[PDB]
């Protein structure tokens, strides 16, 4: 059902980016904040706010160029049916280093560019292309 | 320090011995899915204190019979 909420998060982002929606909302969690805050610090989105404490509701502000999709495509990589893990030297790049790959490690959620100075590996979340 | 396995007991009918099953997670060499693999070992049970389903700690010893190569340390949880 909602068994991969990160894939449910990526579904709501990709639809509203293409359908010219100004802002979207979604149910919040601890992990969804730890991904959207990275995308805010990597120029893909604008802002995120939390609403509700017994029903945590996350909001995202979209981002356009002249009405053109900033996040062109995003690809869920690991999944509950098949887990994907890499080492500190097998971290894949997205568009030969243009896009970023969201990898969650023990030092928090960061990119593969940020994992070079960290020197760790773990679970690939999504290819932010 | 020494080599030590952990698991649970699936059979205890025979005297002075129990059957302990060991589960392990294996990356598949072709697909990568983590699969539970069951390893059924025969463990020497002195005084026969282990029941069914007891999480137990076992270690390595010499072969005591045709099928046995493992012995007992202590029971982690019994008869829950």
């Amino acid at each position: 059902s909602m068994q991969d909420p990160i894939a449910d998060m990526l579904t709501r982002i990709r639809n509203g980016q293409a359908a010219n929606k100004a802002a979207v909302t979604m149910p919040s969690s601890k992990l969804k904040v730890a991904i959207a805050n990275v995308l805010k610090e990597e120029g893909f989105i604008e802002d995120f706010k939390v609403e509700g404490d017994t029903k945590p509701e996350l909001e995202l502000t979209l981002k356009y160029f002249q009405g053109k999709a900033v996040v062109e495509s995003i690809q869920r990589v690991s999944r509950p049916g098949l887990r994907i893990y890499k080492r500190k030297d097998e971290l894949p790049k997205v568009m030969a280093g243009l896009g970023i790959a969201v990898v969650s490690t023990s030092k928090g959620v960061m990119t593969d560019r940020a994992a070079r100075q960290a020197g760790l590996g773990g679970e690939i979340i999504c290819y932010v292309a | 320090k020494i080599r030590t396995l952990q698991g649970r007991v699936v059979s205890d009918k025979m005297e002075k011995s129990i059957v302990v099953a060991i589960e392990r997670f294996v990356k598949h060499p072709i697909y990568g899915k983590f699969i539970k693999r069951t390893t059924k070992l025969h463990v020497h049970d002195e005084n026969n204190e282990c029941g069914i389903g007891d999480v137990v700690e076992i270690r390595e010893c010499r072969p005591l019979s045709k099928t046995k190569s493992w012995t007992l340390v202590r029971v982690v949880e019994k008869a829950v």
Partner: peptide
């Protein structure tokens, strides 16, 4: 298509 299907039986090579 599902990876979990191919755990039970792999792809049948002719």
């Amino acid at each position: 298509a599902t990876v979990n299907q191919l755990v039970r039986k792999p792809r049948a090579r002719k």
